[PDB]
């Protein structure tokens, strides 16, 4: 927590404690680990107190946005106009680099349910829906068992946990779509239509599920909120830097000696994270071509930037990237960056819903151009054209999947233009 240096989180400071499933993930173990401890008191203290405590903690939103959780929760209507309020937890975790939410759902089901109760009380939501990926059948079974147990002991329902508050929780599951993780597309999917995002000028707080005020929040934020109210906002604020306070779950994947999911305070150096928890890059730190810091949506960073880069939101913004999700992907010198970025372009071509013209057409265009560059078929001017197309897509789409499709290609052009030129020239030369 020291302002000079951050890292080396201790076990006493970790929110997610059975993250590795060494213990009973269900209610017996959960009560013994500090779950559902004094939920009566925290909920009874009123929605205003919870909102102010979350605001003081500095908790930004996990899931990619990074938007302050307290302000978003405070946007919810205070008094009913005849329309109920809903809490929807985005447990859809489709993202090419992120595995972190699945461990929480399968090994800490009860923390998520307690967080749903706390946040629904904070936003005055009568009912709650936990959206889960359809592929996560077993994780959904774990969450459903947790919900049933909480209902059985009266932790949920009318007079939930003994406080004069009423909250009902449901578990809903999709059929597989990366777009259904977006706030409006998730609402459309749960309503019963195709998961196509809604134009934002109507905002979900104003009109959401069934036309009623709703808030969509990630599993990790909902899970961290109850212990923030228990442990204290100052404890949460101490660990990270300014504006970036809390601990976050980092999922190291790729060419590392040990791929691990771990909890660490934010503002750890990326080199420190990879070397201590992941065991170092396969073949040593010398053996680095690039690192994708925040899952596949954000632009990649070259080794040189990875030397001094710090695992934070604003700093990765300064490094022309972002910590959307703590899904760090490591590539060796052996790796062909062109082919991996082309596979990400194919991913985005497959995951576009097709609603708006720029995403639906330009993402397939991007995939075709990246495929030609993977073989050297293209010309040297094709790279500049590719940058222009990425600029054409960005900002002119309904949701951010166009931006998430444009960014990896832009990062490849920006930091690894030399290799593309090499491949194009050599194919012509040979």
């Amino acid at each position: 927590p020291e302002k000079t240096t951050f890292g080396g989180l201790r076990d006493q400071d970790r929110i997610f404690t059975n993250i590795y499933g060494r213990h009973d993930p269900y209610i017996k173990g959960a009560e013994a680990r500090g779950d559902w401890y004094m939920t009566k008191d925290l909920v009874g203290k009123g929605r205003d107190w919870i909102i102010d405590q979350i605001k003081k903690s500095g908790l930004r939103g996990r899931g990619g946005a990074g938007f302050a959780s307290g302000l978003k929760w405070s946007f919810m209507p205070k008094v009913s106009d005849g329309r109920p309020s809903y809490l929807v937890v985005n447990g859809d975790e489709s993202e090419p680099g992120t595995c972190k939410d699945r461990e929480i759902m399968r090994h800490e089901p009860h923390k998520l349910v307690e967080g749903c109760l706390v946040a629904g009380t904070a936003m005055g939501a009568r009912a709650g829906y936990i959206y889960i990926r359809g592929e996560f059948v077993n994780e959904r079974k774990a969450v459903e068992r947790a919900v049933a147990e909480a209902y059985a002991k009266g932790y949920l329902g009318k007079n939930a946990c003994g406080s004069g508050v009423d909250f009902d929780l449901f578990v809903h599951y999709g059929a597989g779509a990366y777009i259904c993780g977006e706030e409006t597309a998730l609402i459309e999917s749960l309503e019963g239509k195709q998961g196509k995002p809604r134009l934002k000028p109507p905002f979900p707080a104003g009109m959401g599920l069934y036309g009623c005020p709703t808030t969509v929040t990630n599993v990790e934020t909902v899970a961290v909120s109850p212990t923030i109210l228990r442990r204290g906002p100052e404890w949460f604020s101490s660990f990270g830097r300014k504006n970036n306070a809390g601990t976050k779950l980092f999922a190291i994947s790729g060419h590392v000696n040990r791929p691990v999911t771990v909890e660490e305070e934010m503002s750890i150096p990326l080199r420190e994270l990879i070397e201590r928890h992941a065991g170092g890059v396969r073949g040593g730190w010398d053996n680095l071509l690039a690192i994708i810091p925040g899952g596949s949506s954000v632009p990649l960073l070259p080794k040189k930037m990875c030397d001094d880069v710090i695992m934070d939101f604003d700093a990765l913004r300064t490094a022309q990237s972002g910590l959307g999700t703590a899904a760090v992907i490591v590539m060796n010198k052996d790796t062909d960056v062109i082919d991996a970025i082309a596979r990400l372009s194919y991913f985005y071509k497959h995951e576009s819903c097709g609603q708006c013209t720029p995403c639906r057409e330009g993402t397939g265009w991007l995939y075709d151009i990246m495929s030609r560059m993977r073989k050297g078929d293209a010309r040297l001017e094709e790279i500049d054209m590719l940058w222009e197309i990425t600029k054409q897509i960005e900002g002119h789409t309904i949701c951010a999947l166009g931006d998430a499709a444009a960014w990896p290609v832009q990062g490849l052009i920006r930091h690894f233009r030399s290799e593309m030129e090499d491949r194009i020239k050599n194919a012509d030369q040979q």
């Binding site: 497959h350 057409e361 397939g364």
Partner: protein
């Protein structure tokens, strides 16, 4: 309705019309991403009598009029603004003609009566304006109805009316008779 779905830009005008206005709810965008397609997933035929309006609503010719197919171009046609006698709504229409032939009929804007919509009968009944037409006066004889001049037919009508008197003369007006 003729279909060229390759020309289809994925607006949702046909689906929104079929749902909100026509109310048959037959068309939808099936698929995700670039291979998303518009139309009935099953082989179905559009049942509404307002079906012709999707053709006008279609901006990019993916939905086109099968009766008016490959027959003319837009610049070749002279448009005259008239009304539809198909029913008592009096839908305001624009009749496009090449020479002495009516080529197509399309609606006009009149928020009072027909917002901008036309029924299928009115839109596609111009085909029956070229068939079974009466061109000359006909007077009956032992050989049947035969060609006659206007004077001879009027003479026969005069000889017939001379016999009848008062209520023996009877008039029946049709569906398409005009005020004058």
């Amino acid at each position: 309705i003729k279909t060229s779905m390759n020309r289809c830009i994925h607006c949702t005008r046909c689906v929104r019309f079929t749902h909100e206005v026509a109310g048959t709810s037959e068309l939808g965008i099936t698929g995700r991403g670039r291979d998303s397609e518009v139309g009935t997933y099953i082989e179905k035929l559009h049942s509404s009598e307002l079906s012709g309006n999707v053709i006008d609503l279609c901006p990019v010719g993916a939905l086109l009029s099968k009766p008016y197919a490959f027959t003319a171009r837009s610049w070749e046609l002279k448009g005259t603004e008239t009304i539809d006698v198909s029913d008592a709504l009096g839908s305001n229409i624009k009749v496009d003609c090449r020479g002495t032939e009516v080529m197509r009929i399309t609606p006009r804007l009149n928020d009072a009566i027909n917002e901008e919509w036309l029924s299928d009968k009115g839109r596609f009944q111009y085909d029956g304006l070229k068939r079974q037409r009466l061109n000359t006066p006909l007077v009956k004889g032992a050989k049947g109805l035969e060609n006659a001049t206007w004077s001879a037919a009027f003479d026969a009508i005069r000889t017939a009316i001379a016999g009848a008197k008062g209520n023996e003369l009877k008039a029946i007006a049709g569906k398409l008779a005009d005020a004058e």
